[PDB]
Amino acid sequence: AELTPILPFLFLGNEQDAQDLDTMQRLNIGYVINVTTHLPLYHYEKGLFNYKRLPATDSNKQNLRQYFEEAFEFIEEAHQCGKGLLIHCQAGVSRSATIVIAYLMKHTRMTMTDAYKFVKGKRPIISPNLNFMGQLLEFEEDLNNGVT
């Protein structure tokens, strides 16, 4: 069990981390983003959290940019009402860390490199995915040019 707090309201974890019900309620988490196609929404039937599923796979062809804006608003929703958000996928946190890094670029105004350094400092194990890196690099281009 290990929920990594990126921001006071934004938490990063894997499949096993999302199953620790006691820790999630201790940290005042009320929102969960599940970035998998096959994993269940843990503790859904208990009616404690608001869920959002980004149906993605951990492949070199998966497009995560399409899920960026939807995830940012769910995070803002958790932020604007004083609750924490947990975003998770599987062991390598490749998918979920990509979304978190994207959020830090758009809203916290950090650069792509600095955002990775920020998350990597708090979450030491992140599996590599050149496809997601390319999408984050292309995403930084659009932010600097005023396209998104």
Ligand X SMILES: CC(C)(C)C(=O)CSc1ncc2ccc3ccc(Cl)cc3c2n1
- Check residue 116 for interaction with ligand X (CB under 6 A): yes
Helices (H), 5-128: 21-26, 68-80, 94-106, 112-122
Rounded alpha-carbon distances, angstroms, from residue 131 to 39, 48, 91, 120: 22, 35, 18, 18
99 binds ligand X (CB under 6 A): no
Q: State in Å, rounded, how far the first CA of the chain is from the last one.
A: 36
Distance, in Å, from the CA atom of 141 to the CA atom of 30, rounded to the nearest integer, reads: 33
If the CB atoms of residues 24 and 89 are measured against ligand X, the closer one turns out to be 89
Number of Cα atoms under 13 Å in the Cβ half of residue 43:
21
Reply yes or no on whether 89 is catalytic: yes
Choosing from 27, 39, 126, 143, the residue that interacts with ligand X (CB under 6 A) is 126
97 binds ligand X (CB under 6 A): yes
Binding-residue pattern over the window 24 to 63 for ligand X, x denoting contact by CB under 6 A: ----------------------------------------
Tell me the pairing of strands 50-53 and 10-13: unpaired
Q: Applying CB under 6 A, which of residues 128, 145, 146, 147 lies at the interface with ligand X?
A: 128
Answer for which of 113, 141, 142, 148 binds ligand X (CB under 6 A) is 113
Contact residues toward ligand X (CB under 6 A) are: 94, 97-98, 101, 112-113, 116, 126, 128-129, 132-133, 136
Active site residues: 89
